[PDB]
């Protein structure tokens, strides 16, 4: 049993020991007949004869006899064994030398005979996929096969190109993404697309994706995306040579194109990041750059290149060894051959800093050589003598101003030195150090001229001063220039260790622990009103800090509570759609960190942000349950600490899982009758008391229902004044506890207004409400309006509530005057101004802000003196605080239909305040995407929402221009479809993102249907038109796919109709026979495509682009489309192959995200094959179809589906049954 194989091998070598050819042949024949009668297992006998150690091509007769025997006895082996025998036979035959005498060549064709038999498809001993994968594994792409086999192996590999084409995307190398701070992953070894299986793919798919990587690297804030793309984890010094080479080539490309400041800053930042995170070696990049630039010729970008090098040399020279920075001298020798003298540039231009880069580099190198002295000294370059003399003379002069860039040059040159750096730093920082008297911050152009080391020194000084002042417990406010300069300096991302990570992780906790409450308020206001680009995790971390600060530390002050509430609301509302899930999935363990205990308004705002993000991202498409998702625990813990109900109109727009969650978890509501009875009883009890302490204790007791604002309304409705006791109760209750009183006052106001007359009875009530807001300063306008708009009324009550909001906003002059003045005397580009503080004092002096009930304190029969000191205010006011509330009010007014007319008046009167909005374009994009069903009929409501915030059937030229704008934006044009914008301060990091969002907003604002918009967008390519040049059609398809994927569902659903129209076309329906595979039918890069095959190929390519740019939720409709629409209309092989080409390449995505869809797709493919087999007389592409099915089972599906496919396979015709017999196993 165990020794049978050993005995067989012993008999084999005993037979092989003979020398008589006739005797050997007779023994072989005897073994052959013993095998054919079943005396020996075929696997064992073939393995023994082939793995016998005595077999060698010198024994020609023995080799030939053994191979004819294995050919005779090879037919009874299971396919796994057959595959192993194929592998060992190729391994053995690989050892044959190229030069062999022809006297034995005919004797060594027995191996070719057995390989020919085993690779015959008709016999079907094993699946052809095993044979092709073994052959490809032994012989990779581009390797010429062994001369004995040649054409056999070549053509056998050549018969799998149809399968390799099915499993490939059309024009994949020319599809580019949009970088926003997945499907674009790349191999970190050779920049290859990860290809599944060993199939003979196209040649272009085996080349590195240098173009794609370069395009990604050219965009700002692409660091995280490129790390994710290349699969780099911040855990070890990977030191990617490919990444180093790409960075060097990008620098060379930029210098060649030099023949702006933001661009060079972007490169300097990219090199800084990649050198810091142990992904590149600076000396290695310098040496490679030197080799690449040697013998290039004209080089005009030397100053910019040396500035980029200085940005790292100055920062890292403090600790890094001097040997690393040595090759810079050789690079200077190459790029600066002049040996005469360089003239000193004018010091009145920003370029002066760039022109002094080499002198600064040498100064730093000389200083480093002066430390740890001896070894080697760096002599003065002969050319750079005038520059050194100029710097020395500038340092010698003790009276130097900021009119020119002498300060910047000295700071850049002498940053490393300590003694020579005090004078320029003092001259630069005293003006902002000096509330202090400094009002003019450092200019943005001056800041851009400085180096990274100078910027870090400036921020370190500012942070140290802030910490020292906070620890000193001094009441002096910070310098407005200092705050503005800090806000400006916190934009650069290369200083993350000190800029924003140190601002959030250390500075804010230190100020919190120091009990400053003035520094903390200034920092929070600065974050709210001056920070533009913050990483999402930093934003969420600060949101958690804000929530815990509001909860604890006894911050029972009106101003601090208001600042925390407003800041938290702005961060919650400003979250991105694609960022919510990754940011909130980290807090899955403890949602209470990112949630709140008492701010029902903040929790509801978070819920609304959740709903809009899930709607835009199509997270819930294909699902009808909330369990198993990340939203479940967050919603449950929101229901804790905050039970609330959602109105019908505001709940009907939520996704299905959200609606299902909120149908249950319903909270009972206090009845209006009981509310009115309680208010009347509290008023009668208030008027029945005569003491003072008893009233204060009774009406300020915690746990009593919050009815005191209702009592204030009831009092001054009939007596038109408030006693001193009312002020005492308001002071005692506290700002944090007044929120519940405002919340109940909202419902009481709605009930009272609904149950009231018209005319005088409303004019009086609205005048009372306006007086309470402004004259008495009881409650602040944005808080009141937010609490009104966050209610849960129905129908008539909802109309009354929104009417109250509109009347409170527009009827009096108090808010309109403030908005008009702020808009008329202020500008939003805060980084280009010098007198913001003077404008701020002007506005605040004209309109003072009251937060401690000053008006009510004054209007008491004995006047009451308020002695609560104010925290400093630097940036914010009521107009800027009202913007998120106005966004929410717009959303509610859109949700309710009868109040659509009031929204037009509100926009016409208060639309100028959006000039100060952070992300107006993104806000409109989200608003139009979310409310498409509601606004698709009210076309006039749009063009009014769009015109107020940013500011006829179009022909084909309009759509062509719209696509071409994004095409040229992605390509890169010197004029550009859009003017140059500062990505450090704009909402859009890239012109591509800016153009995409603007185009989507413009398309959604049109008064035409989504079907027409989508059909026209596809028709731009699918119907021949002028001004659509060829040879760039792939990027046109890329732009169309991007736009249509960003567009809502009624816009990208037309692809299914287009696909069906192509399926039912005569090109695929005709029964005309073709020679060979119809390659040109499915290939868009063909010579001449008539019209019908042109339409088919272009439709395939457009579908590939759309489904490559689509999300998984949008891809979830493909299985249902395939099962319901395409299944009963596919009857021909051409249609079957077309569907295989359509859906084939995208199985990998389904495998990674959604498996049930993959199973359904496989079952649908098998049913389609059965339908085609039944309808057609015979099958001509059995081999491609079976190869694709085997590849599917062996790579994606596995043995997952067997029961649903056995019945289908058993009903096929005998030829297909013979081919597909191994799928069942």
């Amino acid at each position: 049993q165990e020794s049978h194989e050993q005995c067989i091998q012993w008999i084999v070598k005993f037979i092989h020991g003979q020398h008589s050819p006739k005797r050997i042949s007779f023994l072989y024949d005897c073994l052959a007949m013993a095998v054919e009668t079943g005396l020996l297992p075929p696997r064992l006998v073939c393995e023994s004869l082939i793995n016998s150690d005595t077999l060698e091509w010198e024994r020609t007769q023995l080799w030939a006899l053994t191979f004819k025997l294995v050919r005779k006895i090879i037919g009874g082996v299971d396919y796994k064994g057959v595959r192993d025998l194929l592998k060992v036979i190729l391994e053995k035959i690989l050892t044959i030398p190229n030069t062999v005498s022809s006297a034995v060549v005919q004797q060594l064709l027995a191996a070719r005979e057995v390989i020919a038999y085993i690779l015959e498809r008709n016999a079907c001993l094993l699946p052809a996929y095993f044979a092709v994968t073994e052959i490809r594994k032994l012989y990779p792409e581009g390797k010429l096969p062994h001369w004995l086999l040649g054409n056999l192996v070549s053509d056998f590999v050549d018969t799998f190109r149809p399968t390799a084409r099915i499993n490939s995307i059309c024009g994949r190398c020319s599809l580019l993404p949009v970088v926003n701070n997945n499907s674009w992953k790349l191999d970190p070894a050779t920049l290859r697309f990860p290809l599944k299986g060993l199939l003979p793919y196209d040649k272009d798919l085996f080349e590195p994706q240098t173009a794609l990587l370069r395009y990604v690297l050219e965009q700002p804030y692409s660091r995280d995306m490129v790390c994710n793309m290349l699969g780099l984890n911040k855990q070890h010094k990977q030191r990617c040579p490919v990444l180093e080479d790409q960075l060097v080539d990008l620098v060379v490309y930029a210098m060649e194109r030099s023949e702006s400041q933001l661009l060079w800053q972007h490169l300097s930042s990219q090199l800084i990041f990649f050198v810091l995170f142990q992904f590149a070696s600076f000396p290695h990049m310098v040496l490679s750059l030197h080799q690449k630039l040697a013998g290039r010729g004209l080089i005009k970008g030397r100053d910019h290149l040396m500035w980029v090098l200085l940005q790292f040399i100055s920062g890292s020279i403090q600790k890094n060894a001097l040997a690393d920075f040595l090759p810079v001298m050789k690079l200077f020798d190459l790029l600066y051959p002049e040996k005469e003298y360089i003239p000193v540039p004018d010091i009145n231009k920003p370029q002066s800093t760039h022109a002094f880069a080499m002198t600064c580099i040498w100064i730093h190198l000389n200083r480093k050589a002066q430390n740890d002295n001896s070894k080697l000294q760096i002599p003065i370059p002969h050319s750079l003598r005038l520059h050194h003399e100029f710097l020395q003379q500038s340092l010698r002069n003790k009276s130097l101003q900021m009119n020119d860039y002498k300060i910047a040059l000295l700071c850049n040159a002498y940053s490393t030195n300590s003694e020579c750096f005090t004078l320029p730093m003092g001259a630069l920082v005293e003006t902002i150090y000096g509330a202090s008297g400094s009002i003019t911050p450092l200019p943005m152009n001056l800041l851009d001229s400085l180096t990274v080391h100078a910027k870090m020194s400036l921020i370190h000084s500012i942070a140290t001063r802030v910490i020292k002042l906070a620890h000193a417990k001094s009441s002096v406010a910070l310098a407005p220039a200092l705050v503005e300069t800090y806000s400006r300096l916190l934009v650069y991302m290369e200083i993350e260790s000190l800029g924003i990570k140190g601002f959030i992780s250390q500075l804010l906790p230190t100020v919190f622990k120091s009990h400053a409450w003035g520094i903390l308020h200034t920092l929070l206001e600065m974050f709210s009103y001056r920070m533009h680009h913050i990483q999402p995790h930093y934003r969420v971390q600060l949101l958690s800090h804000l929530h815990t600060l509001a909860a604890v530390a006894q911050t029972n002050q009106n101003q601090l509570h208001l600042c925390v509430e407003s800041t938290a609301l702005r961060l919650i509302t400003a979250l991105g759609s694609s960022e919510v899930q990754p940011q909130f999935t980290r807090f899955l363990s403890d949602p209470k960190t990112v949630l709140s205990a008492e701010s029902e308004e903040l929790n509801r705002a978070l819920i609304l942000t959740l709903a809009r993000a899930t709607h835009v991202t199509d997270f819930f498409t294909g699902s009808d349950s909330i369990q198993g998702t990340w939203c479940k625990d967050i919603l449950q813990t929101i229901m804790s600490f905050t039970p609330h109900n959602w109105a019908s109109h505001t709940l009907s727009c939520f996704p299905g899982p959200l609606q299902a969650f909120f149908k249950q978890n319903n909270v009972p509501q206090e009845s209006r009758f009981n509310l009115k009875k309680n208010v009347e009883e509290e008023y009668r009890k208030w008027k029945s008391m005569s003491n003072e302490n008893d009233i204060i204790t009774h009406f300020s007791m915690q746990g009593s229902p919050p009815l005191f604002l209702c009592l204030l309304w009831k009092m001054l409705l009939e007596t038109d004044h408030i006693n001193q006791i009312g002020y005492r109760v308001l002071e005692r209750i506290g700002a944090r506890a007044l929120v519940a009183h405002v919340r109940t006052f909202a419902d009481f106001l709605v009930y009272e207004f609904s149950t009231s007359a018209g005319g005088q009875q409303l004019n009086k009530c609205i005048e009372i409400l306006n007086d309470m807001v402004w004259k008495y300063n009881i409650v602040t306008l944005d808080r009141l309006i937010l609490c009104l708009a966050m209610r849960s009324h129905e129908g008539n009550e909802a109309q009354v509530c929104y009417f109250i909001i509109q009347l409170l906003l527009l009827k009096p002059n108090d808010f309109r005057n403030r908005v008009s003045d702020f808009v008329k005397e202020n500008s939003p580009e805060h980084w280009l101004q010098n007198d913001w503080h003077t404008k701020h004092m002007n506005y605040h002096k004209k309109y003072p802000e009251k937060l401690y009930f000053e008006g009510l304190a004054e209007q008491v029969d004995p006047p009451v003196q308020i002695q609560s000191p104010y925290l400093p205010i630097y940036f914010g006011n009521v107009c800027l605080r009202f913007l998120p509330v106005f966004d929410i009010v717009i959303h509610r007014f859109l949700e309710l239909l009868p109040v659509s007319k009031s929204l037009e008046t509100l926009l016409d009167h208060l639309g100028g305040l959006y000039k100060f909005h952070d992300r107006p374009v993104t806000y409109l994009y989200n608003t139009l995407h979310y409310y498409e069903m509601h606004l698709r009929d009210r076309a006039f409501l749009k063009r009014k929402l769009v015109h107020a915030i940013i500011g006829w059937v179009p022909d084909d030229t309009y759509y062509c221009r719209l696509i071409g704008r994004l095409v040229d934006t992605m390509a890169g044009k010197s004029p550009g479809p859009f003017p140059n914008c500062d990505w450090r301060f704009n909402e859009f990091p890239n012109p591509a993102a800016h153009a995409l969002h603007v185009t989507c907003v413009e398309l959604m604002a049109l008064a035409v249907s989504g079907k027409e918009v989508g059909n026209a967008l596809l028709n731009v390519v699918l119907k021949s038109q002028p001004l659509v040049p060829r040879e760039n059609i792939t990027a046109w398809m890329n732009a169309i796919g991007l736009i249509i994927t960003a567009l809502p569902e009624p816009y990208w659903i037309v692809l299914h109709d287009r696909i069906v129209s192509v399926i039912s076309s005569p090109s695929l329906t005709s029964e005309t026979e073709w020679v060979g595979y119809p390659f040109r039918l499915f290939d868009f890069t063909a010579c001449h495509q008539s019209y019908s095959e042109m339409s088919c190929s272009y439709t395939l390519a457009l579908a590939h682009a759309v489904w490559h740019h689509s999300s998984i939720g949008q891809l979830s409709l493909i299985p249902k489309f395939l099962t319901e629409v395409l299944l009963p209309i596919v009857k021909t092989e051409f249609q079957l192959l077309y569907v295989y080409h359509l859906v084939g390449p995208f199985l990998q995505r389904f495998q990674q995200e959604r498996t049930r869809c993959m199973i359904e797709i496989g079952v649908a493919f098998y049913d389609m094959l059965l339908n085609v087999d039944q309808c057609s007389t015979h099958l001509n592409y059995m081999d491609p179809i079976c190869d694709f099915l085997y590849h599917m089972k062996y790579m994606f599906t596995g043995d997952s589906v067997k029961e649903q496919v056995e019945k289908i396979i058993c009903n096929l015709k005998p030829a297909l049954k013979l081919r597909l017999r191994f799928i069942t196993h």
Binding site: I272, L276, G315, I467, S497, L498, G502, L507
Partner: peptide, 11 residues
């Protein structure tokens, strides 16, 4: 008081 890339606000 060296200020490099690998420094932090905490002394």
């Amino acid at each position: 008081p060296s200020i490099h890339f690998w420094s932090t606000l905490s002394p």
